[PDB]
Design a protein around this ligand. Structure first.
Ligand SMILES: Nc1ncnc2c1ncn2[C@@H]1O[C@H](CSCC[C@H](N)C(=O)O)[C@@H](O)[C@H]1O
Ligand SMILES: O=S(=O)(Nc1ccc(Cl)cc1)c1ccc2c(c1)CNCC2
Length: 257
């Protein structure tokens, strides 16, 4: 937990979204796969509404590229102040912001609505209304009087829950906790690491709860969801860079019933 204090946003981005784990040219890379999962889901025109909340966004934005065209009010979050700042720098187009163009581009490519990436980024930057601190450990993750429209029509979270839970039970709770933020009949799009027990972020070393695909499924069920879709990406050996011990990545499309 306190370990997340030494968490360096730039070391994290560099380790996971810079080449080779970030190259999008090769179709069999985790990047193409993940953006594709997101794109396809939203393309079914079933996950929509007005407001959408991104849990534990960290310093990344990709997780919303295909999503931003379906929700006009978007709320980004994260426990660390450093991250919320790193996001602001990208959102305001301030200097030293991480470059996500490559991703915006591939997202536009995958969607195939002939959209240029500048337009896609413009839309995202516009629909992201706020960036609020959050804590998935508290029963009311966002707090008491949150500027964020509640309950949201949909939720999105990539690599958070399992990266902040010491064991399955915690994982389960933090899932129940955020579930409360989602309006019934709503949609949840969760991404995460499969069987990962640790990952580096600069000086900080995070101890994760290694979880499988069935454990993730069952956990979603227990928290009151119906698993619309669940896919797995087994990490190739060339993407095993030393920054962690992840085995694969998962994608879930759940709906609060
Ligand atoms: N208690 C907590 N509740 C919510 N987020 C937390 C948290 N403790 C740490 N975090 C944040 O969860 C993130 C895990 S890393 C995931 C980053 C990003 N969503 C991506 O897709 O890569 C970090 O940004 C960390 O600051
Ligand atoms: O899938 S990734 O290798 N990179 C990656 C993901 C998604 C896209 Cl679109 C491109 C690249 C990855 C992202 C985050 C984390 C980990 C791995 C393991 N550590 C916890 C956090």
């Amino acid at each position: 937990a306190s370990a997340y204090q030494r968490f360096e946003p730039r070391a994290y981005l560099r380790n996971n979204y810079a080449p080779p784990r970030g190259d999008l040219c090769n179709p069999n890379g985790v990047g193409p796969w993940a953006l594709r999962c997101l794109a396809q889901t939203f393309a079914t025109g079933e996950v929509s509404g007005r407001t959408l909340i991104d849990i534990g966004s960290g310093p990344t934005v990709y997780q919303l590229l295909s999503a931003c065209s379906h929700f006009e009010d978007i709320t980004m979050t994260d426990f660390l102040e450093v991250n919320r700042q790193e996001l602001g720098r990208w959102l305001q187009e301030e200097p030293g912001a991480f470059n996500w163009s490559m991703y915006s581009q591939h997202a536009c490519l995958i969607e195939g609505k002939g959209e240029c990436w500048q337009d896609k980024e413009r839309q995202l930057r516009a629909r992201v209304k706020r960036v609020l601190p959050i804590d998935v450990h508290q029963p009311q993750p966002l707090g008491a009087g949150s500027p964020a429209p509640l309950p949201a029509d949909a939720l999105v979270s990539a690599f958070c829950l399992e990266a902040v839970s010491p064991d399955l039970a915690s994982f389960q709770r933090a899932l129940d906790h955020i579930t409360t933020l989602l309006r019934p009949g709503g949609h949840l799009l969760l991404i995460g690491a499969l069987e990962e027990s640790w990952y580096l972020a600069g000086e900080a070393r995070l101890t994760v709860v290694p979880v499988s695909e069935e454990e993730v499924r069952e956990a979603l069920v227990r928290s009151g969801y119906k698993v619309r879709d669940l896919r797995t990406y087994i990490m190739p050996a060339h993407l095993q860079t030393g920054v962690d011990d992840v085995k694969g990545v998962f994608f879930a499309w759940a709906q609060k019933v």
